[PDB]
Amino acid sequence: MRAVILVGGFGTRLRPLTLTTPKPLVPFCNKPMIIHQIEALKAVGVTEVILAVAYRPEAMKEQMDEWSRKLGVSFVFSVEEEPLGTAGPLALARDILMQDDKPFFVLNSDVTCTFPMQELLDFHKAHGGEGTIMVVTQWEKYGVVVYSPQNYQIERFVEKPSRFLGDRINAGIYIFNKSILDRIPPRRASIEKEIFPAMAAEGQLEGFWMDVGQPKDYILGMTKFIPSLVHGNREHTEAVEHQRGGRFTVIGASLIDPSAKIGDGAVIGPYASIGANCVIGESCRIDNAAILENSKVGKGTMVSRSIVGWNNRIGSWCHIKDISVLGDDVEVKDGVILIGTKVLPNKDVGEHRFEPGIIM
Amino acid sequence: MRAVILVGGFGTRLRPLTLTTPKPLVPFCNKPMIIHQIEALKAVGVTEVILAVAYRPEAMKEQMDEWSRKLGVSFVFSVEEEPLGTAGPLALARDILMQDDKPFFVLNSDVTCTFPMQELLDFHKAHGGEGTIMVVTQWEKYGVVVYSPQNYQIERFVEKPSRFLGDRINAGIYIFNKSILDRIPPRRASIEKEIFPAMAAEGQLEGFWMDVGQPKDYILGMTKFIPSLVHGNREHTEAVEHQRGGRFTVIGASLIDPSAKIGDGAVIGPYASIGANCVIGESCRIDNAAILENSKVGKGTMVSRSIVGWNNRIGSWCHIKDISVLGDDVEVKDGVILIGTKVLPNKDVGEHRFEPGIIM
Ligand SMILES: Nc1nc2c(ncn2[C@@H]2O[C@H](COP(=O)(O)OP(=O)(O)O[C@H]3O[C@H](CO)[C@@H](O)[C@H](O)[C@@H]3O)[C@@H](O)[C@H]2O)c(=O)[nH]1
Ligand SMILES: Nc1nc2c(ncn2[C@@H]2O[C@H](COP(=O)(O)OP(=O)(O)O[C@H]3O[C@H](CO)[C@@H](O)[C@H](O)[C@@H]3O)[C@@H](O)[C@H]2O)c(=O)[nH]1
Ligand SMILES: [Mg+2]
Ligand SMILES: [Mg+2]
């Protein structure tokens, strides 16, 4: 009946875009990352969502703007504990307890997946069935390796192993009972306080899954996510939007906000997202690139596999390719080629950069 | 009544384009380099032009194609003497003498200028007044430094001085009397056999001038030459051609052959030349670039300050910038960025190149 969406975190990996807005609130395709999870939780039977915000408590205004659909008015913060925020639910053990006794969800704010949230009870094992499903299944460099046999047990939990194999990792979605919040409230920073060795069956995905918290991970997660959204979002059959401005062609599926304007002959490539009020030039090429909001693009740029931040002003014949994240209010002069260079907010780029790097 | 246009030479400096056609026959703006000089000679009083062709005697067919206007049928070659071809006029001393006794012009085939060819006799000093006029006035690295006082005498003649100052250099256009061809015919290779120390008067440019024999020199000479052509060729007032295909905008003056096709929204930049039968994409940018013939360009490329050879097929969203000469029948894949890379004929480019170099 309640969920704990961990939103407090510096967002160091997605740095060029998180210098302006918290990582939960940077849009993924056309909505903020937390909004997808909040919509899934609205689909399942919960009403109140509590947020543990630490990095930037000024997300309250944006949440109130998005507060119309769901009652997510709850907001708690005293002092920076941890981006992982194990004490997050523990610091708010009183609110979860006295209102209701039902199990409470715990989710990361930078995770995208099918979001099952099944109405099936799954009362023999809470987190084992959900989160990382048992047949997740990717590189072991990031995320915790989970060793689970066919009988849904867990005995090992290593956050960042050096080389331990175990391609299965947690999806980042957890469901806990009221005993967990009362089990280990250490009152300080800790990492998820998983004491799974002690027990099995109590207390503690088939679909795409991606930890959308890094630029390349952002692009790959968008690539995996856009095809799965064709069933429900706006249902001219090549993509979600094919006629918004003039006459443009689309290759593959793409998400284009009806408020955007597209020039004559632009080629919106596979798995691309165009934000609200965005303007796209005559003969652009948006190949697996995300344009956030209010950005303007000249005639003939090819922004490919990169991210264009809010209120940008891209030049006329630029190349923004590889993994190059542009910050807020970044203006790029005509003919500038950016390849894997991250630009901090409020900068003007007039020089070419053929190697990965950072622009202050 | 006769002229000797030196056309025999390997064209090593303009190599990527001269591997297919001799340097005289590579088009400058819309016509071969020799054709401008032949037209100027036709403007002045002369009928027969003799060519000393060494590198490729296959230029005969193209000359016969251009033979309609002028009687340039003469062609002489026995064995490779020199690209400078001092023995050129000397090896054909019999034809110039017996036919006529009038002074004969001598020109380089890679020189562009105002081409005065004044009908004034200027018989007090033949080459002093013409060629390098005395007030040429450029770098001393290339060309011979000519030291001329206000009385029009030549004393020193050093082909490639190390550091001798003397910004004045010869224009490359010479006029000689019948004594020169009978003075020193050594029957072998030599360098212009200039014996100016012996004589001062009659023994033998106020305008733009450029030795168009190098890629960067080609671009700069085209830049200096197109504005001077606005008076004569085709006299919508921004450039020579402004409406040939769809609706495109032009910045500055440019030469576009009526046989070409231009897309909707292309921006033909300052001092650009488009060849016959060439096709330009929807939103290209032709900035100080020359398209030779039959080349096709996709939607949104920016070919800037570079040369695109015959029968090319440029990709859709390329960037051919800096001084990057493309050879005959070179195909470039979409999104390829070429910066100062010369491509030999009959090659396919699919990889980026951010540094000057050669593509085999
Ligand atoms: N940096 C950041 N982290 C946040 C934020 N909001 C919440 N977090 C939480 O910070 C935690 C760790 O930061 P991440 O970079 O997001 O996770 P990670 O360290 O790459 O790995 C963690 O997430 C995996 C999910 O893919 C999980 O394996 C597990 O949470 C792991 O500790 C996550 O649990 C996430 O909920 C934010 O705005 N910024
Ligand atoms: N390489 C080449 N040279 C040719 C060709 N046809 C004629 N030539 C003659 O080859 C001579 C020297 O080669 P260039 O590269 O054209 O001249 P340069 O060595 O840069 O300098 C010469 O030209 C200057 C005019 O700018 C003059 O200073 C003088 O001719 C000097 O030797 C020039 O006189 C030119 O007429 C050709 O197809 N290729
Ligand atoms: Mg994460
Ligand atoms: Mg020359």
Numbering used by the authors:
A (entry chain B), B (entry chain E): 9 to 143, 146 to 214, 220 to 250, 255 to 379
Task: Give verbatim excerpts from the published study on this entry.
A prominent therapeutic target for antileishmanial drug development is leishmanial GDP-mannose pyrophosphorylase (GDP-MP or GMPP, EC 2.7.7.13), an enzyme catalyzing the formation of GDP-mannose by condensation of mannose-1-phosphate (Man-1-P) and GTP. As GDP-mannose serves as a central precursor for biosynthesis of diverse glycoconjugates necessary for host–parasite recognition and is essential for parasite survival, disruption of Leishmania GDP-MP activity leads to complete loss of virulence, suggesting this enzyme as an attractive target for development of new drugs against leishmaniasis. LdGDP-MP exhibits a hexameric structure with a molecular weight of ~245.3 kDa, consistent with previous observations. Each subunit is made of two separate domains, a N-terminal Rossmann-like fold commonly observed in nucleotidyltransferases and many other nucleotide-binding proteins, and a C-terminal left-handed β-helix domain containing tandem repeats of a [I/L/V]-G-X(4) hexapeptide motif, a characteristic structure found in the transferase hexapeptide repeat family.
To gain insights into the catalytic mechanism of leishmanial GDP-MP, we further solved the cryo-EM structures of LdGDP-MP in complex with its substrate, GTP, or the reaction product, GDP-mannose at the resolution of 3.0 Å, or 3.2 Å, respectively. These structures clearly mark a closed and well-ordered active pocket with approximate dimensions of 14 Å × 15 Å × 17 Å, delimited by β1–β4–β9 in the central β-sheets as the pocket base. Structural comparisons reveal that binding to GTP or GDP-mannose induces significant conformational changes primarily for the loop regions surrounding the active site, and results in an overall more compact conformation. Indeed, the key lysine residue (K170) in the F(V)EKP motif shifts ~5 Å or ~8 Å towards the catalytic center upon GTP or GDP-mannose binding. In the GDP-mannose-bound LdGDP-MP, the guanidine moiety, compared to that in the GTP-bound form, scrunches ~4 Å from the cleft end towards the catalysis center. Intriguingly, the GDP-mannose molecule adopts a seemingly unfavorable V-shape conformation, which may facilitate the condensation reaction and subsequent product release. The sugar moiety is secured by the close contact of the hydroxyls with the central β-sheet amino acids, as well as the Mg2+-coordinating residue D226. In particular, the K170 side-chain in the F(V)EKP motif inserts deeply into the catalytic center to make close contact with the phosphate group next to the sugar moiety, indicative of its direct involvement in catalysis. The catalytically essential Mg2+ is coordinated by two absolutely conserved aspartate residues, D118 and D226.
